[model samples]
Target: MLKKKQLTVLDLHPGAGKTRRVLPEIVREAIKKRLRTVILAPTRVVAAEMEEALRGLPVRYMTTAVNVTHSGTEIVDLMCHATFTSRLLQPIRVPNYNLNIMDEAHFTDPSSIAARGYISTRVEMGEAAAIFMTATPPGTRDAFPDSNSPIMDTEVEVPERAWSSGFDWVTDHSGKTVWFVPSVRNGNEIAACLTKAGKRVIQLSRKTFETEFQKTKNQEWDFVITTDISEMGANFKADRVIDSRRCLKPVILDGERVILAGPMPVTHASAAQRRGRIGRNPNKPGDEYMYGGGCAETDEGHAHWLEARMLLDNIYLQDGLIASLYRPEADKVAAIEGEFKLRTEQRKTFVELMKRGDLPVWLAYQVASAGITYTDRRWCFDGTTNNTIMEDSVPAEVWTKYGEKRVLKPRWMDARVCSDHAALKSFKEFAAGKR
Candidate 1:
């Protein structure tokens, strides 16, 4: 058994100092085992950046193996792959290195097509030793175990110092008129209103006024009012940005005031980009708020909370690993029993509640957090029945005040999650591991 001292999960200690020491050790281990160790970065920029950092090592980070056995029948190998994109797409063909390392592995949520395909690919032939490096891992820990993924070894939790700096909104211009376009009907009207704000106020598309945009980039206008699509890819210099309509959480551009008319998932990409806008240059500082008109504010920094849980859960399952880490004490199992039973009962009740014809799908998700015990009985009563079973109904105020309860909401209770069969399956598997 690998001693706990040999492996660790650094929580938040960052900066190159740690990586400098750790990377070399990991590489040495790979060389000792003659393993093809791989590292996965979240974004192209990060991959490119880290690749450069590894180049500085004495035992140069080779994209391939130490020896050249060209005479053998073996074809192309990914010993030190050119890029994560390339390696992930063709992991099997890559050299069978001893270990694989992944950074920002949270992107492999298996929800989207890209994440799903990437995960499926890794699960197949990438049997080499693997190490996933990510501050925010995906899903709940107990949800996805090592057995779940053919290639996935138990994830190591690296403890490090990481602090949340919050978010910000900024853009150029002295006074830009902000408009809110709530629904589809009002979208064009808002567009027209923006255009009337200034001639440069044109919609942003792939082909949105390139020449004019260049002019703006070259210090031509005070500011250009473009759509959100223009915000992604590459960096832009902007003082402040504001959207009175539904804008993506990753308001990639830094603006003075970012106002969104509707709520959207504060995706990891969005949170990363949102933070990137302000700190790219050292001399700037700002605040970011994930506010909802009728919803509770969110700490976007915890974008990977669910994922972190998933990783921890997976790590705890391996019977051998558990014995190696925490002894198989009867008390530990007894303590875990309460949490597991609560979660199971809660999930069961949610499924039952959803079957009711009168309940709004949204409401079902609302109280799902209370577990099988309804947080608010007022909302539980069927509207058609008009029968107030409980004297006190849960007012919107109480639900809003303690919304974190919803984070633990049974997946079945969430209509959005329920419709997602794949996610549901993954969650069920994760839940089953608690046993």
Candidate 2:
């Protein structure tokens, strides 16, 4: 069914080994049909995992890096290859594959130029079949905008018997256990509590996550704590996984008033990925526990909890319903004008006005030069004396008539006038001494 359709979206439940079981079969059939396949992952970690998983298969896989070239033999024998999404936009030549598989499909946004180019290169323009494999389908038509694409979206609720409350919850578990938290502070706190109870634990820090992952990829451990790092495309099987931060958090951008619920903020995709940390396969039956912490009991906190709970409980009902509920209302004019058209003309006009002295640059150049060249200091009296005292200080701004009519170029106005590092060092040293 997947191969017959031009494009297919498979919303496989988390922990179902969606790619593990399906990828090999896809490769086998593609090889038999004398076609090629390219698999894409959103992050480097996922790409690495995909490449490692395909080692045994009769496929020559490669990672996409800057200026890397693929030989003709590698391309022809490469039944399955894994590369980052950004690599699709690079100028490097890509062989025309007959099939393309996107591992974590939810992260691809067709509105972006890179993602659009990726799909266009393999499927749309090249006339290839494509499969989207994700536990949580974003339901936005951006990736599959056409109404003609086939979809096999499904969801399942695994038993939640593995969930537990309180700080001492690790004592009850026997096999490998994983804890999910919002921040490193939270993970450290949980690791401390678990260690006090005589339980061995490891907190995966941001700096050493990739390094440590390589070390313990196959090794077994008592407990592993992580942040948002292991939320997607990571394969781990444990008896139980505790999700500590299961609440809505707003994302606000600079100079913007509107708030956004992130792909992390209690959305369907986030929830599914958290649930997927454990209970990896059918044989390794495990449970997902959404424990305490983060959200409060107050009115404001209660509203946030309710919003998250609604999405979690009803994420599988429909594709776009949860996204639509949490998505912010857009200002049609502003959004259209912001993305649909180029702002070069408007920016040029604004820069011209600023260049005409309507807007002042924060620092002046001649003042900076004077401070660098002069090092003389004079003092008349001490603090105990009644006479005035003079000391060397920063050169004041000389915004004279000549300065105003300096004839600044619009293009170079934003650049810092200080060119030499010695001048900058002198000015910094003078400013520091005064402070």
Candidate 3:
């Protein structure tokens, strides 16, 4: 089990089997302590992968559901990738598991639903020691306070490369390549182009994503085009790994919040992760790895593909090469630069909640720390109406006053405002500001 009161962050390089190697040990330790554990994966595929890896271990695991149940063999809740999203929608006061292990720690964006849900659970269950394992550390320090700590900062020596053009690079690779794209639409477009050129290609869809594992095991494909979904869990060992969507294309307005979706910056972390997919063939040499794909095409379809790619190369690579090669347009720079500033400022708001004692510090920290500001409907107790109201109508003051209450109403049985509770007593206690 995790050492009590100690947090461990393990940075494992790609292809390191971070989940396969570490999870079973943690599960066994939790069993020894006779405490329930929860293991969180970034996606359903990853969750399933981890579950399969733990088959021989003496732990009974369940894929997390709305009505979660635990029985028998040292209960360990294996939260599917959607756990955090669901928890964010309908905040759940989860039972305190002695140990919680979060794999792919770098994916925890402060503004993401997953990170928000994780923060809530982490705070409510104060006693649990968490193990955060990832190849990339979280970008911001506040999300995980001790990000700089080198408790387990493992590194692997892998060769890196720079390419002038993706089209030219792929032509050099010739065959046996995997191209990573952003969306299903883009994947289809790329697959079509490669197919027209007489390249044997297979595009991964929701239906065929996993089934291809069996299909390709015995067969050989010249090219495979896929989306970000395949970034984790899924495996493809190709001669070259190509990132077709390294450039930021456009901005999206997600409810008045300017977001960068298609044009999101391709960080060094993901680039490294995708590149690790290749050179895994038993016949290929270990050091023989080739990575292609860089900003290509024109600014007409995508405003600043080259410029965005230049920013990414500069941010990730210390050599400062290609830094002065391209100059981004004023308008394109403002959209991306502005969006990042807004995101950072939004996360700062929640961080301020850390100073409040009346509120559940974890609750505020989780929302703020995750940098997600989508608080449409939160749990609340209505004092005026003498009833527990779990709706958007509840004022912010009411939520701030009693939102942190671990137990509320009718002899302190209800765990959260949304849980089963006696309305009158819950509201009255909140009215007195002493629940």
Candidate 4:
């Protein structure tokens, strides 16, 4: 049986490298004490990377604690564990483990696909120790005003819910932004107003968007506008965004400044997409705003309200009691599990912010540039993917020689490969004198 415990949430910046540090330290300590632990990352790549980093430490006991996914060996070994029967429909039994770690704690919302797997593990493995490793927590600060709830207002609340009760929490926890229009000519009218006001204007033509998008893939663009043909292909980050759609909502942005100005879309998905583009860096400390309707609240001004409602509902549903599942005592496990289920939900918030039909040209470029990485092309590396490539690609027969199927593979690459080669080169260049 899992013992219950209490925990406090840790709020960190977007650039926080705590995940890289805290995880290793926790595992090392647990291993030193011979305690069992289980780690769950948001993605397969993340999971494999984490397992690799923990390999061959001075830890005690069994050798097979670290397992990689998708490999032929991994599939066979997983079949041995009754804990992971199927991807979705399996009911897993709790293993003899003491602690659990869940990276990215905000993906548990109904809008997220990760919620099922996340909640399933907890229900099957009740009472295990859990730690949430995430850059952003789902739900708004206003919703979970008290630590009692992660964030309040939006529906199925979290973490035991002993203190807070009822369908609606104390207040609305969702962030909202809205807009106004004069008539059917508003799209062109608003476009004209922003241009006349000296704002940078870009009208997308077919050729310009594609040429600039690919051309600027290596370079950066201040603003590039094109047609729907460049939809997902327009890979860049813009400092400003303006999206106006007759069928959807209108959005305005400047630098880090953002404005959600339009009627709330009729569907929840549409409304969320519109507000997703305002800003993305959670670690950067700054202020952002969501526009609200003047004086009275109407259906036209309810995008934020709707988002808040959905957030609440999702939190409650994942917390389990609303869904008729019961979790045993342990406030710490509850909090971590509760938070993890919501990370996917938080991403939905980002998706909602980008719903307007127009794209922010420069910001698009920024996101694209950020995606480019290589040992030769880019000197800096986070070491998140190296582990997977090394472990997953290994052949089954070779890997079995190390021990059982569950064990980590021996170091296959030169130590210098992942050892920050660029930094070493920089040091050698700068310290040109013999010591």
| lDDT ranking, best first | 3, 2, 1, 4
Query: Over all chains combined, what TM-score does candidate 4 have?
Result: 0.31
Per-residue lDDT of candidate 1, residues 55-94 (tens digit): 5333333243233234432221222222432333221244
* Model 3 bad stretches (over 4 Å): 64-71, 88-93, 108-113, 116-126, 140-175, 205-219, 245-264, 279-283, 286-435
**Candidate-wise lDDT, in order:** 0.31, 0.42, 0.46, 0.30
Output the better candidate (3/4) by TM-score. 3
Candidate 3 lDDT over 1-435, as tens digits, reads 265555576766555667877777777778777767777776655766786787755554445412223455547767753354334323245565667677776552222223423333353345557777766553422111121111111122211232234445465554576667665555666777767767777776543565655555567788777655565556765555556435333332222111233434355555555555654343454322333333222233222332232122212112322122112122223333212212345434433332221222223333443454433112333223333334344422332342554322121112222322233334434434443
Q: Which ten residues in a row have the lowest lDDT in candidate 1?
A: 323-332
lDDT of 2 by residue, 253-354 (tens): 231111323213344455456656655455533244444333221122212222222212221212322112112111111221112111334333322222
- 174, model 1: CA deviation in Å? 6.7
Residue 234, candidate 1: Cα error in Å is 6.8
Per-model TM-score, in order, reads 0.34, 0.53, 0.53, 0.31
Residue 354, model 2, lDDT: 24
